[PDB]
Amino acid sequence: ICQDVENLQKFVKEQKQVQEEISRMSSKAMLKVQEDIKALKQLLSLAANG
Amino acid sequence: ENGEKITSLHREVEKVKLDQKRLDQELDFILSQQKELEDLLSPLEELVKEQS
């Protein structure tokens, strides 16, 4: 049994690591995009009006 | 949501390039009307120093 808790907390925690891992990983790259396509669309309107 | 815009961006972009091409080669040709209609206003410099 107390082999036991040595492992389970270990597999659980191993998992929290991945949770951290995702947490480390987070977006600005994404936020960037809408701004750009919103911007490119506008230049296209230029060229078109030109 | 952004991808879609991207789409009608692609769209309407290559129809802008259908545009310009066209207007491009147009300008050649309005341009060529200007090299011909010119050589030959004269060679209309014969026909008019002859009359002279």
UniProtKB/Swiss-Prot annotation, chain A:
Post-translational modification here is noted as: O-glycosylated.
For this UniProt entry, which segments traverse the membrane?
Answer: none
Which sequence ranges form a coiled-coil region, renumbered to this chain? 6-26
Which superkingdom heads the taxonomic lineage of this protein's source?
Eukaryota
Location(s) in or outside the cell: Nucleus, Nuclear pore complex; Nucleus membrane
Additional note from the record: In rat, the p62 complex contains two different isoforms of NUP58. Isoform p45 has however not been isolated in human so far.
Domain comment in the entry: Contains FG repeats. FG repeats are interaction sites for karyopherins (importins, exportins) and form probably an affinity gradient, guiding the transport proteins unidirectionally with their cargo through the NPC. FG repeat regions are highly flexible and lack ordered secondary structure. The overall conservation of FG repeats regarding exact sequence, spacing, and repeat unit length is limited.
Q: Which family does it belong to?
A: Belongs to the NUP58 family.
| Assembly with partners or alone | Component of the p62 complex, a complex at least composed of NUP62, NUP54, and NUP58. Interacts with NUTF2. Interacts with SRP1-alpha and Importin p97 proteins when they are together, but not with SRP1-alpha protein alone.
- What functional role does this protein have? Component of the nuclear pore complex, a complex required for the trafficking across the nuclear membrane.
The name on file for this protein is Nucleoporin p58/p45
Q: Which organism is it from?
A: Homo sapiens
Q: What is the lineage of its organism?
A: Eukaryota, Metazoa, Chordata, Craniata, Vertebrata
From Swiss-Prot, chain B:
Question: Known post-translational modifications?
Answer: O-glycosylated. Contains about 10 N-acetylglucosamine side chain sites predicted for the entire protein, among which only one in the C-terminal. The inner channel of the NPC has a different redox environment from the cytoplasm and allows the formation of interchain disulfide bonds between some nucleoporins, the significant increase of these linkages upon oxidative stress reduces the permeability of the NPC.
Q: Which residues are glycosylated?
A: T7
- Where does this protein reside within or beyond the cell? Nucleus, Nuclear pore complex; Cytoplasm, Cytoskeleton, Spindle pole; Nucleus envelope; Cytoplasm, Cytoskeleton, Microtubule organizing center, Centrosome
Q: Which residues carry this modification: Phosphoserine?
A: S42, S52
Record disease entry: Infantile striatonigral degeneration: Neurological disorder characterized by symmetrical degeneration of the caudate nucleus, putamen, and occasionally the globus pallidus, with little involvement of the rest of the brain. The clinical features include developmental regression, choreoathetosis, dystonia, spasticity, dysphagia, failure to thrive, nystagmus, optic atrophy, and intellectual disability.
Comment text on domains: Contains FG repeats.
Q: How does it assemble?
A: Component of the p62 complex, a complex at least composed of NUP62, NUP54, and NUP58. Interacts with NUP88. Interacts with NUTF2. Interacts with HIKESHI. Interacts with OSBPL8. Interacts with CAPG. Interacts with SAS6 and TUBG1 at the centrosome. Interacts with MCM3AP isoform GANP. (Microbial infection) Interacts with Epstein-barr virus BGLF4; this interaction allows BGLF4 nuclear entry.
Describe the function of this protein: Essential component of the nuclear pore complex. The N-terminal is probably involved in nucleocytoplasmic transport. The C-terminal is involved in protein-protein interaction probably via coiled-coil formation, promotes its association with centrosomes and may function in anchorage of p62 to the pore complex. Plays a role in mitotic cell cycle progression by regulating centrosome segregation, centriole maturation and spindle orientation. It might be involved in protein recruitment to the centrosome after nuclear breakdown.
Tell me its family: Belongs to the nucleoporin NSP1/NUP62 family.
What is this protein identified as?
A: Nuclear pore glycoprotein p62
